[PDB]
Each structure stands twice: as structure tokens, then as C-alpha cells.
């Protein structure tokens, strides 16, 4: 049962994935071995390569060769444009991000033994592509990569709002995963410099800080607007304790200054 | 108006020419003034009958061509509706049907003088038929195999023309005839349909996948320049249809439901037929053994379930101890020892079969069927009808399979599965494995054509005469699905559940019951206890003896059995009246339709009754076009089933009431315009899969009344006599004459052929089917002869005992 | 259709029901031999 729960952790179903992770973390410490999840996962990663755990995280739970491991970027969907096919890839990326953030965040594995090895991984490429192409623009960004010729037309407000909600959940998950990587691994800042934190993450962070509505965060809802400042300040406090302080300071200063406040509040009648 | 005038004038000339050609002496039966007028209108001068006919045909063709030319001028509306396209389609189809009937009447006579005249007719037919189909014509859509068979006889005139003309027809106009197009992808005329086949594959892969799988196991590409191209095209279509192999594993899972002890029996039968016909062949025998052992010998199968896994574990050592590890010993084995080995194996297999009732222990794939992510969506087969443009987004997709599997208590043991679709409803189907269901699909298509014909006749449409049809979807040559009719039971079960305990016990066990008294009478009239009892009884027993015996045997069966069955299932008299009326109407329609198509194996288990509406539903179409009267050892001489129960149900009314009127109206509707039905039946009987070899195994898989394997060594399978007798029936022939012709074709050397035809023809003293001419009968006279032949006690007293003529 | 029993791979008085006990191995979510008895009045339809 715990093997099945582990193998079905990277499935795109949000509630089912949460339940499969909770049941795993509740059933492992009561196995006949009676040990922590870290020790059991370490003892099971030896009889078979870490590629097993990698394909478990990235590869979908429902379909084995159907995760982001078989399609790292959105440029692998041969079908035409469809919100149902964009949201499924978004949910696969979210399921991978949550699995990584839950496993590395609970000290179950090492941040460098699962993401800094020589095995095939598609997490960094996917998150970099998302931050560089989708995380900044509207649904047109996801539409310009599904057979670019003969682009679609205007979308309904619900079709736009569900896409915006999915993108705003994915960006928050990326922020939480980066905060986890920073707060847990003191030397894990190396592998996230290649494509994760160069300019795209800093740009989307300083954009979320100043104008959240430009990314798609709906204002008229308190269930997420009372959590977004928390993850924002946590990511900023994690960056201020890292060598990435300089680029954060540069982006933040070029985004907001005192003269900006002055020219904004000059006329108030 | 000019187009319509030209059309009507050509039609009048065609009618006059056909009337003259059907009765050349009828010209003298008219006044000399009218005959002179006809001679002047014909344009001929030789006064010869053939000259006048040719002149009238020439005038008709000229007028029809002028009408079509006028229709092809200044008639191109952007919004092609059913109003403006009416006259254009009418002209196209009129010219096409004229030239097509000319070509057909030319292909029947060996001596062909009309050669220079009938030169541009094939190309004209093809072009006009395709241009009408482009205008969304149903009459042109239902006559596409006519073009497919015309381009075969006249390739140099129509191959390139059709190849360049069909490229402008919507691909969804061929879904109804996709099985004919995918079947000739290895012939020389394959290029004419490759474009439409590829377009269908690109747009609607679910509507071509099963026919392509059926046709792909019989391709015989030749070693020519065009053969390699056809094989490459077929390979590309196969690679484009094998999207994710979902169809293949679905077919495998459905095949896991079939009983292995019956697949083994079928394999033994076909290798037995292969081991005796020709001097023993090595390659074919080893290929059959490999294809058999791949599913019943290897425990390492992809989708093996516990049901077949137990059979494999129990009978995989015998396939090595008796067979030579791949067929070496089987190849050098003799037919006599092989028979004993197979009989012992079949005994020890049927000793313990125990079909399971849970889907998890017979086919694991369907048990844990889960809709994957970004995978190919499976679809419930049988939803692509060639009527209009299909909407695949509205088609029901398979979302799961129910866990309960119901096994039927028949010989072949079919399985009933319940497929749960994405529409939140259940769809039950009947899984029949090891049986070719293509003939049943073609019969259902013929019934759909008949329903379309009946829907256009006023006398039939005002009474809502429609045959109850179901969807038959063959996937391979040994597996197919059949739509399960909800809340329906067979007629024999309805009759048996109505009898009381004592009545049922008497009918089944008492030695004076009809089932036993009939065999006792056959023994006392023949002296034998085998099939030869009928052969000797047809010679020994006279009319009076068997008539009195049958009238006495009928008396031991409850009279109002069906009436009690109908009053037991109804509450108010309104319900009983409606049930009885619907039963009578549906039974009359089924009888007349099956007589038109020549269905013969109409016993009590081939009729299903809807327990909520009372209608009758025909199933199990194994015999067609007189196949039961021609090839069975005990010939069936009745056109349909009109036994004593059906007569007693209508009391105090007679058979000349509702059933007679329904039969007359249906026959008149079928004979009004039989061109479409005749063309469809001719396409049916000319299928390469409907030869004698397929009929052999079809009869072997049942063994109900057929004699045996090696009894009929000759073929004697006449594909043209079937459609000839069908046209004779639709022309007004006497049913007794058709029955006698079928008897002459089937049992000519039998010692009771004279008695057979004497019983089938009747006597001019009691049965009115010999007091009438052999042709030219009206619909009413034909129905009277049919009811006289189907209720003749002299015929019913000599029927095979499994048909149960007493009830 | 009704469910069919799963095929095997290979190989105290009448009118006496259990009595209502109180021992429960699971604790109720705050928001031993079996004793038998006979059918009372309001147990079965009259
Ligand atoms: N389309 C159908 N819908 C519902 N029930 C069906 C259907 N076809 C067959 N059946 C039921 O399944 C039984 C067996 O099916 P099948 O037609 O394969 O039998 P069979 O070989 O013709 O046997 P028999 O001739 O003895 O009736 C029928 O007697 C009938 O009760
Ligand atoms: Mg039958």
C-alpha cells in the first residue's frame, strides 16, 4: 500500500495527490521497520536507482509515461490550442512542484541528490520555460505555442479566469519551492542559478511585489490575497540571506524608488 | 421548366420502351392508330420490335442528356439547399439510373448488339452519380458500390475519371460504404479510393479502424509496380491508425472474454479442413498452429486473465505432448489420429469450463480501465452512420466497464458486458467471439435500407411500419459486438414461461408430447432414427396421413398460450389490445421482409419479444437468400413462421385481417421501386467474404440442422441465382415456384426431390398456390400464396423437429 | 445482473442474534466473548 501511494504521488489530481502524500507520511512511520520516512526512502533508493524516484516525481501517477518527464515544455503538445490541454500541463507541472517541495521540504531527501545528479530531469527546464514565456503574459502566451499559425480569437471571461488562477497557483508554488530550496540547503543555490533564478524569477517576483494584477491575481478574493504577501516576504527574506541579494536589490530599486512615490503622490486632489 | 419537360419526356420514352421490351406482342394489342403513333415517335422505319425499342431508348437518352445539360447551366447557388438542388439531383439520378439499367440489361445477355450505343454510359453514370453525391443525395449515396463495381468491369473508361472526380466529394459521404473501399486497397482500382480513405483516416479514424483491421488480415498485394504502391499506402494508413494501440489492446481484452475451449474447437476444425482438402501443407498448418498457440499456449500473454490462465496452465502440456513443439508432430500426423486426439481434448476441456461472472478474473484490462491523461480517448463502437456529417464530439466515449458479466446459456456461450460511457449512462453489449459478424452487419444494413424504403411509402408511413434493428459492430474476423436489446426475451421462453407446471412437464417429459410423438411418427413412417427419417418419410407418407397426424399433434398444445402470455403481462384491456396489435404488426412485417431477403432459420429462439411494447425482433441471420432451402439436408419449405399460436392469438379474427393488410402494404412498398433494394442485395451477394467457404464454417460453428463437414464436397454456391430469385420475388413470381427452383438448385440428386417439389408446390384441391400462374401475380395474390404455404399442414408435418412447427 | 461469487483458485441457535454491547475498540470521535439474545418485540415486523 505504501509503495502504491508513493507511485501515485505525482498525479495531476490536486486533492488526490494531497491525500496520497498525507497517507504516505502517515503510513511510513508505522511500517514493520518503525522508522522515519527519510530512513525508509534512503533504504529504498539503494536497491534501485534514483531514476525511479525521479520518474515517480516528474512522471504522472495516472499515466506512467505521461508527466512532464515526457514533455518538459509546452512545445510538445501536437494537438491544436485548447485550454483543457494547457491546464493539464499546468497541473502536471504543479504536481511535480508540490512533490518536490514536500519531499525536499520535510528533509526526506537531499536537495542535491535528487536535482543535482546526472539523471534525466525536466523540472528546471519546465519552470524556466514557464517563468520566461507564460508567467508574465495572458492566455495569448499559451496560445502562441500551439501551432502558432492561425491564432485564436477572444476568450470568455471564465476561460481566462481559470487559466489565470492556474498560472497564479503555479507561480506561488514556484516561489514556495525556491524558498524551500533556499531555507533547507545552504549550498543548494548553485543548481538553481543555471536557468531558474537568473532574471525571470527576479522579474516575476518584483512584478508580483509591485503590481500583482499584472500577472493575473484577482483582487476580489481574500483566501489568496492573505497568503500571497506571506510567500512574497518569505521569498524575499530567503533571498536576503543568499548571494542573490545584489540582483534582488537592483531589480527592486529599478522597479520602485522614492522619486516614484513623490511623482505618484505629488497631486492628490 | 425546360429541364423538367426534358426529364418527363425522357421518362415517358423510357416507360414506353420498357413496356415494349417486356411484352413485344403488346404492340398488336393496341389500336392501329396508337401503334402507328408509337412507330412514328420511335423514329425507326424497319417496323421491327428491336428497332422500335432501340429508337425509343435513343430518344429517351437524348432527352435525358438534354435535361442534364440544361441542369448544368446557370444553376450554382452558393447556399445549396434541398430546394434548388432538387431538380439537379433528379436529372442526374434519372440519367444515371437509365444508363445503369441499360448497362445491367446488357450485362445479362451474352449476345450484345447494343455495343456502339452503350459506349459512354459507364463514364456518364460515374460522373453524374458523383456529381449528385456532391450535392448530398441519399439515392446517390446508397448506390456507391454500383460505381465501385462499374469501375471494375470498365476500368479504362472510368478509372481516371472517378479518381479525379471523387476528390471533390466530402469524405463523410463514404462512412456507410467504408468496408467496401478498404477491401479493394490491394486491387488495381485502389487508386480511385485512396484519397477518400486517407481523408477519412485523417478526419474520422474511429470510423475506419475496425473495417481496416478486418480487411488488413486478407491483403494479397501482387509483385508489380502498382502493387508496391498500394502496399506502401496500406502500410502508411496502418501506421496512421495505430495511434497508441488502444484499439488493439481493447480488441485483445474483448477476446479474453471468449471461451478458450471453443477457440480451440474452431482451430481444430479449420486445421482439419486444411489437413484433408489438399496434400498436407506445411506453411499453412504451422501458421495456424502458431496463431492458435499464441493465445492458448503461452502463459506470458500481454493481457491474460485468470479465466484463460487456468485453461493455459491446464492444457499447455498437452499441446506439447501431442503436438510437436510448434507443429512438427501435427504436420506429420494423420487425419484419423488427429480426430481422436481432438475429441479427447474437447471432452477433457468441456468437462470443466466454469465461465466466470466477474470482469476482474476474465479480462484484467477492462476491470481497471482508467482514462489516462493526454491519451487517445476510446469510443463506443457503432456510432458512425453514413447518413450525414458526423460530430465526434457528441459521440459517447468509454469511461469504464461494469464488473458484472452475464453468460448466456446457448451453445457458443456469449458474454454480456456493460460499458459505462462519459454520458453517465450504461450501454450493454453482447460479446460473441470466434464468429464472423459481417454478414449480420450487412443484413442489418439491408434492413435499414428497407426501413428507409418503408418510410417513403404513404400506406406504410401512415401505419409506422419499421423493422426493429440493432447495431452489429465486427472488429476482427473472429470477434464483434452486438447491441443488447433491453427487457427482451425470446419467443420460446415467453411460450414456456406461460405454461403451468403440469403443462410444461407434459410438453417436455410426457412421451405423448409433440417433441417425442413427432420423432415416433417419423420412425414409424421411415424405420430410421436419424436424419434419413425425413428423406424416407417424404417418400412413404402421403398427404392425408401426415395432415391428420399434424392436426392431432397440434391438439396437445395449449391453444391460447400467447393470449394468456399477453393477458398475464397487461393490467387494462387497453394494454392487451395494444400489445396484441403491435405483436401482429411487427410479426407480419418481419415475415414479409425475411421472405424478401430469403431468411429461413426462423425457429422460436430467433424471435425476441419486447416485454414492454410487445413488438417482435428478428435475430440470428445465418441463412439468407434461400440458403436454408438449398443447402440443408431437411429443406425448409415455408417462407416464414405463421404457426398455430400466431393464428390463435388473433382469434376470433382470421389471418385475412391485420397481418394480411400489413404484408400486402409492405410488399407493395417493396415492389413499387425495387431498384435500390435490388442494387443493395446484388452488392450483398457479390461480396468476396460471402462465398461457400465462409458458409461452411458458419454452419460448423452451430451444427443445428446442417448435415456435417464433408457431406457437401462440391460448392454449388450460385451467386447470381440468389439475386435472380430476389428480382423474381420483387417482380411478382409465385412463392411455390421460387421454392421449387431453390429445391432444384440444392437437392437435385436426392431421391426425394420429386416429393420435395410436390409438397412445396401443393395440390390444386386444398392449397391456393398451384391454382395461380407462375408469374405476374399481384401483391394480394402473392400474400395469399405466402399465407397458404406457411400454414399448409402438409408442409408443417414434414418440418425439422427443431423448428417446432406444432407451436 | 447480480454479482457472482468469485471462483476459488484451487481446493449458535435459531432465532438467536447478538446482544447490544458497549465495548468498542475504537474511541468515538468527540466533537471478550460475544453475547447473544432472542428477538424482541420491535425487532421484526408484526
Ligand atoms: N441482440 C440481442 N439482444 C438481447 N439478447 C440477445 C441478443 N442476441 C441474442 N440474445 C440472447 O442470447 C441468446 C443466445 O444468443 P445467440 O443469438 O448467439 O444464440 P444462438 O447461437 O442463436 O442460439 P439459439 O439458436 O439456440 O437461440 C438468445 O437466445 C437470446 O436470448
Ligand atoms: Mg438463434
DSSP string for residues in B20-61: HHH-GGGGTTS-HHHHHHHHHHH--SS--HHHHHHHHHHHHH
Cα–Cα distance for residue pair B237/B222, rounded to 1 Å: 18
* DSSP 3-state of A152: coil
Atom of ligand 1 nearest to the CA of B704: 25
Give the rounded distance of the alpha carbon of B655 from its chain centre: 28
Contact B793, B740 (CB under 8 A): no
What distance in Å separates the CA atoms of residue B258 and residue B479, rounded to the nearest whole number?
9
Strands (E), B302-425: 398-401, 406-407, 415-421
Query: For this experimental structure, what is the resolution in angstroms?
Result: 3.0
Q: Is A134 left (phi over 0), alpha (psi -120 to 50) or beta?
A: alpha
* CA angle centred on B804, ends B800 and B806, rounded to 5°: 115
Dist CA B705 CA B606 (whole Å): 14
DSSP designation for C28: P
Contact between residue B231 and residue B185 where contact means Cβ atoms under 8 Å apart: no
β-bridge partners, B406: B416
Contact B358 C4 (CB under 8 A): yes
Q: B182, B208 in Cβ contact below 8 A? A: yes
The Cα B804–Cα B110 span in angstroms is: 46
Q: CB distance B370–A62 less than 8 Å?
A: yes
Distance in angstroms (rounded) separating the CA atoms of residues B286 and A58: 47
The whole-angstrom distance between A27's CA and the closest CA on chain B is: 25
Q: Which residues pair with B618 in a beta bridge?
A: B607
Residue B578, judged by CB atoms within 10 A of its CB (0-12, 13-18, 19+), counts as middle
What's the distance, Cα to Cα, between the start and end of chain B in Å? 60
Sign of the Cα torsion B782, B788, B791, B797 reads negative
What is the distance between the alpha carbons of residues B624 and B629, in angstroms, rounded to a whole number? 10
| Residue B399 and residue B423 in contact, taking contact as beta carbons nearer than 8 Å | no
The whole-angstrom separation of Cα A140 and Cα B62 is 62
Cα–Cα distances (Å) from B272 to A8, B265, B284, B680, in that order, read 51, 10, 12, 36
Query: What's the CA gap between B183 and B215, in Å, rounded?
Result: 6
Cα distance between residue A76 and residue A126, in whole Å:
12
Distance from A231 to chain B by nearest Cα, in Å?
Answer: 31
Tell me how far apart the alpha carbons of residues B669 and B526 are, in angstroms, rounded to a whole number: 45
Name the DSSP class of B404. Answer: B
B584: number of Cβ within 10 Å: 21
Distance CA B543, CA B555 (A): 19
CA A182 from chain centre, in angstroms, equals 14
**C-alpha distances out from residue A11 to A20, A57, B299, B374, Å:** 9, 9, 32, 13
Q: How far is CA B128 from each of CA A24, B131, B209, C13, rounded to the nearest angstrom?
A: 70, 5, 30, 87
- Tell me which residue has cell 500541463: A89
- Helix ranges, B438-527 (H): 438-456, 458-461, 491-496, 501-509, 514-526
Which residue, among B380, B592, B632, has the nearest Cα to B481 in the 3D structure?
B380
Find the farthest-apart pair of alpha carbons in chain B and give their distance in angstroms, rounded.
Answer: 90
Separation between Cα atoms, residue B39 and residue C37, nearest integer Å: 110
Question: What count of Cα atoms within 13 Å lies in the side-chain half-sphere of residue B499?
Answer: 18
SS3 for B409?
coil
Extract the C-alpha cell encoding B7. Answer: 426529364
Distance (Å) of CA B183 to CA B177, B207, B219, B243, B805: 10, 15, 8, 21, 41
- Pick from A63, A72, A51: which is nearest to A11 by CA? A63
Of B494, B208, B196, nearest to B379 by C-alpha is B208
The cell numbers describing A186, all together, are: 545552504
CB-CB: which of B354, B406, B418 is closest to C7?
B354
**Cis bond leading into B634, ω under 30°?**
no
| Residues of chain B contacting residue C4, judged by C-beta atoms under 8 Å apart | 356-358, 404
Cα–Cα distance for residue pair A7/A25, rounded to 1 Å: 13
φ, ψ at B580 (rounded to 5°): -65, -45
Q: What are phi and psi of A202, to 5 degrees?
A: -65, -40
Q: Do chains C and A touch (3 or more CB pairs under 8 A)?
A: no
In the three-class reduction of DSSP (H, G, I as helix; E, B as strand; rest coil), residue B721 is classed as: helix
CB B428 within 8 A of CB B414: no
Q: Which residues contact B748 (CB under 8 A, 6 or more apart)?
A: none
Report d(CA B729, CA C36) in Å as an integer: 79
Q: Locate the chain B residue with the closest alpha carbon to A89.
A: B374
- Residue B280 is classified by DSSP as P
CB contact burial B250-279 (16+ within 10 A = b; e otherwise) = bbbbbbbbbbbbbbbbbbbbbbbeebeeee
- Dihedral of CA atoms B665, B668, B669, B671 in degrees, nearest 10, equals 160
For A182, list phi and psi in degrees, rounded to 5. Answer: -75, -45
Q: Ligand 1: which of B620, B623, B800, B803 to mutate, judged by most atoms within 8 Å of the beta carbon?
A: B620
* Residue pointed to by grid coordinates 446517390: B140
Percent helix, strand, coil in chain B (nearest 5)? 60, 5, 35
Chain C adjacent subunits, 3+ CB pairs under 8 A: B
DSSP letter for B392, please. G
| CB count in 10 Å sphere of residue A148 | 9
Measured CA to CA, the distance from residue B535 to residue B153 in angstroms comes to: 44
DSSP letter (8 states) at residue B379: B
Are A54 and A42 in contact by the 8 Å Cβ rule? The answer is no
Cis peptide before B652 (omega within 30 of 0): yes
C-to-N gaps above 2.5 Å in chain C, after residues: 11, 31
Cβ proximity of B402 and B417 under 8 Å: yes
Beta-carbon contacts of residue A209 (< 8 Å; ≥ 6 apart): A232, A236, A252, A255, A256
* Eight-state DSSP code of residue A154: -
Distance from C-alpha of B594 to C-alpha of B572, rounded to nearest angstrom: 33
3-state secondary structure of B23: coil
Pick from A192, A217, A72, A226: nearest CA to A135: A217
Asked if B349 contacts B264 with a C-beta cutoff of 8 angstroms, the reply is yes
Angle at B502 between CA B501 and CA B504, to 5 degrees: 65
**Smallest Cα distance from C4 to chain B, Å:** 5
CB atoms within 10 A of CB A240: 11
State the distance between the two ends of chain A, measured CA to CA, in whole angstroms: 67
- By CA distance, what is A76's nearest residue in B? B374
Residues 6+ apart with CB under 8 A from C9: B306
Contact B791, B767 (CB under 8 A): no
Gyration radius from chain A CA atoms: 20
Pairing state of beta strands C16-18 and B616-618? unpaired
Chain C residues lying within 8 Å of B356, measured CB to CB: 4, 7
Residue to mutate, B406, B484, B619, B705, ligand 1, most ligand atoms under 8 Å from C-beta: B619
Å from CA of B803 to ligand 1 middle: 16
Tell me how far apart the alpha carbons of residues B189 and B174 are, in angstroms, rounded to a whole number: 17
Count the alpha carbons within 13 Å of B117 in the hemisphere toward its beta carbon.
Answer: 17
Nearest to B610 by CA among B510, B747, B470: B470
Q: Which of B245, B373, B375, B400 to mutate to test the interface with A (most CBs of A within 10 A)?
A: B373
CA distance between the termini of chain C: 32
Q: Which of B757, B746, B713 is nearest to B623 (CA)?
A: B746
Ligand nearest to the CA of B437: 1
Exposure of B772 in the CB half-sphere (CA atoms within 13 A): 27
Contacts of the segment B764-772: beta carbons below 8 A, 24+ positions apart? B767/B792, B767/B794, B769/B734, B769/B735, B769/B736, B770/B736, B772/B734
Residue B348: which residues within 8 A CB-CB, separation 6 or more?
A: none
What are the angstrom distances between the C-alpha of B798 and each of A164, B638, B735, B738, B804? 81, 11, 18, 19, 11
Q: From atom 6 of ligand 1, which residue's Cα is the shortest distance away?
A: B484
Count CB neighbours of A22 within 10 A.
12
Q: How far apart are CA B169 and CA B543, in angstroms?
A: 61
Tell me how far apart the alpha carbons of residues A226 and A214 are, in angstroms, rounded to a whole number. 18
Bridge-based pairing of strands B406-407 and C16-18 is: unpaired
B366 burial via Cβ count (<10 Å: 0-12, 13-18, 19+): buried
Read off the C-alpha cell for B175.
Answer: 462512412
Indicate the SS3 state at residue B450.
helix
Give the determination technique.
cryo-EM
- A 10 A CB-CB count for B610 gives 19
Amino acid at each position: 500500500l505504501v509503495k502504491w501511494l508513493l507511485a501515485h504521488c505525482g498525479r495531476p489530481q490536486t486533492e488526490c495527490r494531497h491525500k496520497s502524500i498525507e497517507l504516505f507520511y502517515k503510513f511510513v512511520p508505522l511500517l514493520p521497520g518503525n522508522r522515519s520516512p527519510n530512513l525508509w526512502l534512503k533504504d529504498v533508493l539503494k536497491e534501485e536507482g534514483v531514476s525511479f524516484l525521479i520518474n515517480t516525481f516528474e512522471g504522472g501517477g495516472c499515466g506512467q509515461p505521461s508527466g512532464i518527464l515526457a514533455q518538459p515544455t509546452l512545445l510538445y503538445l501536437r494537438g491544436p490550442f485548447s485550454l483543457q490541454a494547457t491546464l493539464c500541463w499546468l497541473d502536471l507541472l504543479l504536481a511535480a512542484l508540490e512533490c518536490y517541495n514536500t519531499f525536499i521540504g520535510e528533509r526526506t531527501v537531499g536537495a542535491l541528490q535528487v536535482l543535482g545528479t546526472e539523471a534525466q530531469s525536466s523540472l528546471l527546464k519546465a519552470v524556466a520555460f514557464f517563468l520566461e514565456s507564460i508567467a508574465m503574459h495572458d492566455i495569448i502566451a499559451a496560445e502562441k505555442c500551439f501551432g502558432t499559425g492561425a491564432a485564436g480569437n477572444r476568450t470568455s471571461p471564465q476561460e481566462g479566469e481559470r487559466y489565470n488562477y492556474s498560472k497564479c497557483t503555479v507561480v506561488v508554488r514556484i516561489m514556495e519551492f525556491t524558498t524551500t530550496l533556499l531555507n533547507t540547503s545552504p549550498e543548494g543555490w548553485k543548481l538553481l542559478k543555471k536557468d531558474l533564478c537568473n532574471t525571470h524569477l527576479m522579474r516575476v517576483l518584483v512584478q508580483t511585489l509591485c503590481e500583482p494584477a499584472s500577472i493575473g491575481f484577482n483582487i476580489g478574493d481574500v483566501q489568496v490575497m492573505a497568503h500571497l504577501p506571506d510567500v512574497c516576504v518569505n521569498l524575499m527574506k530567503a533571498l536576503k540571506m543568499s548571494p542573490y541579494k545584489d540582483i534582488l536589490e537592483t531589480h527592486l530599486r529599478e522597479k520602485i524608488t522614492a522619486q516614484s512615490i513623490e511623482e505618484l503622490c505629488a497631486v492628490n486632489l | 421548366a425546360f429541364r423538367d419537360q426534358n426529364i418527363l419526356l425522357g421518362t415517358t420514352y423510357r416507360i414506353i420502351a420498357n413496356a415494349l421490351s417486356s411484352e413485344p406482342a403488346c404492340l398488336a394489342e393496341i389500336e392501329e392508330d396508337k401503334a402507328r403513333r408509337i412507330l412514328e415517335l420511335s423514329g425507326s422505319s424497319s417496323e421491327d420490335s428491336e428497332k422500335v425499342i432501340a429508337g425509343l431508348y435513343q430518344r429517351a437518352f437524348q432527352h435525358l442528356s438534354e435535361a442534364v445539360q440544361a441542369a448544368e447551366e446557370e444553376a450554382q447557388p452558393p447556399s445549396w439547399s434541398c430546394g434548388p438542388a432538387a431538380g439537379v439531383i433528379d436529372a442526374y439520378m434519372t440519367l444515371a439510373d437509365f444508363c445503369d439499367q441499360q448497362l445491367r440489361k446488357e450485362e445479362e445477355n451474352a449476345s450484345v448488339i447494343d455495343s456502339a450505343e452503350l459506349q459512354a454510359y459507364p463514364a456518364l453514370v460515374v460522373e453524374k452519380m458523383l456529381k449528385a453525391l456532391k450535392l448530398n443525395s441519399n439515392e446517390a449515396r446508397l448506390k456507391f458500390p454500383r460505381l465501385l463495381q462499374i469501375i471494375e468491369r470498365y476500368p479504362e473508361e472510368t478509372l481516371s475519371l472517378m479518381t479525379k472526380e471523387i476528390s471533390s466529394v466530402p469524405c463523410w459521404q463514404f462512412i456507410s460504404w467504408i468496408s467496401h473501399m478498404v477491401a479493394l486497397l490491394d486491387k488495381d482500382q485502389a487508386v480511385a479510393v485512396q484519397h477518400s480513405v486517407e481523408e477519412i483516416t485523417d478526419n474520422y479514424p474511429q470510423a475506419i479502424v475496425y473495417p481496416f483491421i478486418i480487411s488488413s488480415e486478407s491483403y494479397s498485394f501482387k509483385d508489380t509496380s502498382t502493387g508496391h504502391k498500394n502496399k506502401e499506402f496500406v502500410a502508411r494508413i496502418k501506421s496512421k491508425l495505430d495511434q497508441g494501440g488502444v484499439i488493439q489492446d481493447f480488441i485483445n481484452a474483448l477476446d479474453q472474454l471468449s471461451n478458450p475451449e471453443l477457440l480451440f474447437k474452431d482451430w481444430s476444425n479449420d486445421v482439419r479442413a486444411e489437413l484433408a482438402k489438399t496434400p498436407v501443407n506445411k506453411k499453412n498448418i504451422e501458421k495456424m498452429y502458431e496463431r492458435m498457440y499464441a493465445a492458448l499456449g503461452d502463459p506470458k500473454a500481454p493481457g491474460l486473465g485468470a479465466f484463460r490462465r487456468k485453461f493455459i496452465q491446464t492444457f499447455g502440456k498437452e499441446f506439447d505432448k501431442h503436438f510437436g513443439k510448434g507443429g512438427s508432430k501435427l504436420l506429420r500426423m494423420k487425419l484419423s489420429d488427429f480426430n481422436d486426439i481432438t475429441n479427447m481434448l474437447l471432452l477433457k476441456m468441456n468437462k470443466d469450463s466454469k465461465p466466470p461472472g466477474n470482469l476482474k478474473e476474465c479480462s484484467p484490462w477492462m476491470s481497471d480501465f482508467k482514462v489516462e491523461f493526454l491519451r487517445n480517448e476510446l469510443e463506443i463502437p457503432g456510432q458512425y452512420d453514413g447518413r450525414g456529417k458526423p460530430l465526434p464530439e457528441y459521440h459517447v466515449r468509454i469511461a469504464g466497464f461494469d464488473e458484472r458479466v452475464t453468460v448466456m446459456a446457448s451453445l457458443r456461450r456469449p458474454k454480456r458486458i456493460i460499458i459505462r460511457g462519459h454520458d453517465e449512462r450504461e450501454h450493454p453489449f453482447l460479446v460473441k467471439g470466434g464468429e464472423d459478424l459481417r454478414q449480420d452487419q450487412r443484413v442489418e444494413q439491408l434492413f435499414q435500407v428497407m426501413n428507409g424504403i418503408l418510410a417513403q411509402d404513404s400506406a406504410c408511413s401512415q401505419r409506422a411500419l419499421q423493422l426493429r434493428t440493432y447495431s452489429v459492430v465486427p472488429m476482427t474476423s473472429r470477434l464483434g459486438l452486438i447491441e443488447w436489446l433491453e427487457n427482451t426475451v425470446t419467443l420460446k421462453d415467453l411460450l414456456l414461461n406461460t405454461m403451468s407446471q403440469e403443462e410444461k412437464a407434459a410438453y417436455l417429459s410426457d412421451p405423448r408430447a409433440p417433441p417425442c410423438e413427432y420423432k415416433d411418427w417419423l420412425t414409424k413412417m421411415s424405420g430410421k432414427h436419424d436424419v434419413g427419417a425425413y428423406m424416407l418419410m417424404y417418400k412413404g407418407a402421403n398427404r392425408t396421413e401426415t395432415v391428420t397426424s399434424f392436426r392431432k399433434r397440434e391438439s396437445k398444445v395449449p391453444a391460447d398460450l400467447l393470449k394468456r402470455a399477453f393477458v398475464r403481462m397487461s393490467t387494462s384491456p387497453e394494454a392487451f389490445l395494444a400489445l396484441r396489435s403491435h405483436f401482429a404488426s411487427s410479426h407480419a412485417l418481419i415475415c414479409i421482409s425475411h421472405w424478401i431477403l430469403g431468411i429461413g432459420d426462423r425457429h422460436l429462439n430467433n424471435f425476441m419479444v419486447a416485454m414492454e411494447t410487445g413488438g417482435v425482433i428478428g435475430i440470428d441471420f445465418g441463412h439468407a437468400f434461400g440458403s436454408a432451402t438449398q443447402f440443408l439436408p431437411v429443406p425448409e419449405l415455408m417462407p416464414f413462421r405463421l404457426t398455430r399460436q400466431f393464428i390463435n392469438l388473433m382469434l376470433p379474427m382470421k389471418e385475412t385481417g391485420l397481418m394480411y393488410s400489413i404484408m400486402v402494404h409492405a410488399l407493395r412498398a417493396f415492389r413499387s421501386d425495387p431498384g435500390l433494394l435490388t442494387n443493395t442485395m446484388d452488392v450483398f451477394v457479390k461480396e468476396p467474404s460471402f462465398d461457400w467457404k465462409n458458409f461452411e464454417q458458419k454452419m460448423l460453428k452451430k451444427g443445428g440442422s446442417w448435415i456435417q463437414e464433408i457431406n457437401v464436397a462440391e460448392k454449388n454456391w450460385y451467386p447470381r441465382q440468389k439475386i435472380c430469385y430476389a428480382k423474381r420475388k420483387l417482380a411478382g413470381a409465385n412463392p411455390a415456384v421460387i421454392t421449387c427452383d431453390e429445391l432444384l438448385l440444392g437437392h437435385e440428386k436426392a431421391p426425394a426431390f420429386r416429393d420435395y417439389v410436390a409438397v412445396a408446390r401443393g395440390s390444386k384441391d386444398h392449397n391456393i398456390r398451384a391454382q395461380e400462374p407462375e408469374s405476374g401475380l399481384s401483391e394480394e395474390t402473392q400474400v395469399k400464396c405466402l399465407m397458404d404455404q406457411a400454414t399448409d399442414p402438409n408442409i408443417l408435418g414434414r418440418t425439422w423437429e427443431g423448428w417446432e412447427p406444432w407451436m | 445482473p447480480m454479482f457472482v461469487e468469485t471462483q476459488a483458485s484451487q481446493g449458535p441457535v435459531a432465532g438467536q442474534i447478538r446482544a447490544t454491547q458497549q465495548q468498542h475498540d475504537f474511541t468515538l470521535t468527540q466533537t471478550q466473548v460475544v453475547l447473544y439474545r432472542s428477538y424482541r418485540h420491535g425487532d421484526l415486523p408484526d
